[PDB]
Symmetry: C2
Subunit: 519 residues, 2 copies
């Protein structure tokens, strides 16, 4: 039975996913006894805490510290545990995103322009998103995701991957820039709150940490499929390679005493940032004065656009995770996770907490972590609820391990970002055609879209795709980035009409494959 | 070796006396860059990414290419000193 199907029953698709998924409860409970699950837990723990800290610092310095880092980590823990507990697909990883930050800063700018409160209206926005998601899910209007082919999916994934790789190198370049290379340095500079001024051996040591971590990780991964050791020892080595490299880099950093490297910073306790102009509960009616009536009647509009953003991104992520190619065994849900995320965003907005949603890179990395692979062929993927709830509990309780987190150099995590970025390049078909662009036709592959169409036809199709990617890059670089989703959905009609009017029907059926195998 | 403070009133003309901030570890960086580029080029040489003439012609001179890249990288940086070749004035 189809996870998506036009059903004339109220709560139809929801109950269908319920009946498809709940009878596997005991199996989901049982299947998390392997150490590879623990490896996934420890890896995604870092992979979720580090961008959380980055985004928290960014929005703290952006929003006059209206919201900080402690609220973000506590929330991320709450949505992680509950999404693992009651999610139809608990294999997703939730978090904040860049366009969401753009929305928050735009709302803050609008509020300051009008003189309104920033945190007060968020409760009302939660109210409109709650009523609107009830309205939408009432009609089971998910079938629109059927219009998304592999073209739009892969182009969105590729742009996300390239953007995040660019962010990683931007981080490294900025940290290098903060301490330039001079000939002489004055040593009467204070270092207590922050590193002020250039330092001799810090930035390039961070670069060395990145390079060594990445080199060791790739050498280990390439050796994992070798034939140097018995299979048991080889599997034991392959199960926990990344934490092994992490420990090696950490001990190397701890052995060095003189040079300073920036380490992790976490809240002291479960406390608010302002602790002066805020409390645990925000009164929706008004903190210092009453909330305007014309705002009460006209503030529904941004709720529409934020719901559109979270809806499209979550459903695209659900398409990514639940593809049958990665040995998708049990049932996969779309409606239940979406409803849970939107309702939880609303109730978090009741507390003043911003909304969170599943992240693409974290989700694909999570799917990659729980993979049983062969000598190649992919046998299976271990799917259950335990890893996500464990990760969320760990990010909730990370505050209690202050000395351990204070000894982690920041560049090792950046190397880990480089690792996830390069490993997110596996499932792309656009990368396959990009590789095909340069290779001579004498050694071109056995896939149907090489035999059935000519050489310059493949080159022109990939040129169309990269031109689309360049336009999307111009859109994301545009300061009016709020129009970012719109051009994206502009991909949907363009494939149906213009391309078949230039290409042919056999090229249409061979190139735009719904599944990797079947064409 | 690595310290926290370095005195800048030391003479460098006949030979580098005393520790210096960014010399030997930069030589280690050059180690990594040169070796990594050489291995990447050699492994890519027998690939199938270019037409055969172009690929083999490019791979025919990998070591001087990496040497030139390292020399230009060294020349671009001005402030720090790295030890260079010494030859007699004459016969």
């Amino acid at each position: 039975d189809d996870p998506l199907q036009q059903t004339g029953q109220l709560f139809g698709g929801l109950v269908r996913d319920i009946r498809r998924r709940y009878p596997y409860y005991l199996s989901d409970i049982t299947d998390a006894f392997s150490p590879q699950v623990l490896a996934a837990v420890i890896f995604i723990y870092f992979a979720a805490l580090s961008p959380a800290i980055t985004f928290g610092g960014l929005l703290g310095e952006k929003t006059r510290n209206q919201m900080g880092v402690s609220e973000l980590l506590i929330s991320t823990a709450v949505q992680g545990i509950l999404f693992a507990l009651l999610g139809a697909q608990p294999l997703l990883v939730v978090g904040f995103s860049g366009p969401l930050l753009v929305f928050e800063e735009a709302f803050f700018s609008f509020c300051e322009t009008n003189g309104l409160e920033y945190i007060v209206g968020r409760v009302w926005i939660g109210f409109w998103l709650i009523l609107l998601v009830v309205l939408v899910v009432a009609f089971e209007g998910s079938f629109l995701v059927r219009f998304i082919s592999r073209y739009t999916q892969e182009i969105f994934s590729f742009l996300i991957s390239l953007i995040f790789i660019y962010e990683t190198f931007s981080k490294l370049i900025k940290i290098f820039q903060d301490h330039p290379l001079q000939k002489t340095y004055n040593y009467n500079v204070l270092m207590v709150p922050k590193p002020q001024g250039p330092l001799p051996n810090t930035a390039l040591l961070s670069l060395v940490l990145m390079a060594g971590t990445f080199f060791f990780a790739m050498m280990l991964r390439k050796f994992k499929n070798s034939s140097y050791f018995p299979g048991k020892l080889r599997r034991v080595i392959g199960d926990f390679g990344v934490p092994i490299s992490i420990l090696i880099m950490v001990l190397v950093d701890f052995f060095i005493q003189d040079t300073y490297t920036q380490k992790l910073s976490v809240p002291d306790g479960f406390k608010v940032s302002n602790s002066s102009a805020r409390g645990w509960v925000i009164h929706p009616l008004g903190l210092r004065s009453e909330f305007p009536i014309w705002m009460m009647f006209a503030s529904a509009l941004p709720a529409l656009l934020v719901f559109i953003l979270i809806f499209l991104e979550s459903q695209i992520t659900t398409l990514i995770v639940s593809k049958p190619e990665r040995k998708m065994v049990k049932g996969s849900g779309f409606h239940l996770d979406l409803l849970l995320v939107v309702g939880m965003g609303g109730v978090a907005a009741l507390f003043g907490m911003p909304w969170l949603s599943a992240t693409t890179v974290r989700s694909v990395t999570h799917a990659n972590a729980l993979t049983v692979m062969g000598k190649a062929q992919i046998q299976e993927v271990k799917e259950q609820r335990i890893s996500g709830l464990l990760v969320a509990v760990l990010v909730g309780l990370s505050i209690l391990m202050e000395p351990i987190l204070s000894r982690i150099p920041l560049a090792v995590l950046f190397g880990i970002f480089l690792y996830m970025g390069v490993t997110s390049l596996s499932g792309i078909q656009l990368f396959d055609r990009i590789l095909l662009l340069f290779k001579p036709p004498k050694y071109h592959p056995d896939v149907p879209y090489v035999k059935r169409v000519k050489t310059w036809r493949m080159h022109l199709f990939t040129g169309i795709q990269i031109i689309c990617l360049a336009v999307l890059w111009v859109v994301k670089s545009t300061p009016a980035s709020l129009a970012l989703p719109f051009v994206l959905i502009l991909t949907v009609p363009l494939r149906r009409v213009l391309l078949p009017l230039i290409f042919r029907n056999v090229e249409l059926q061979c190139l735009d494959a719904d599944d990797a195998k079947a064409t």
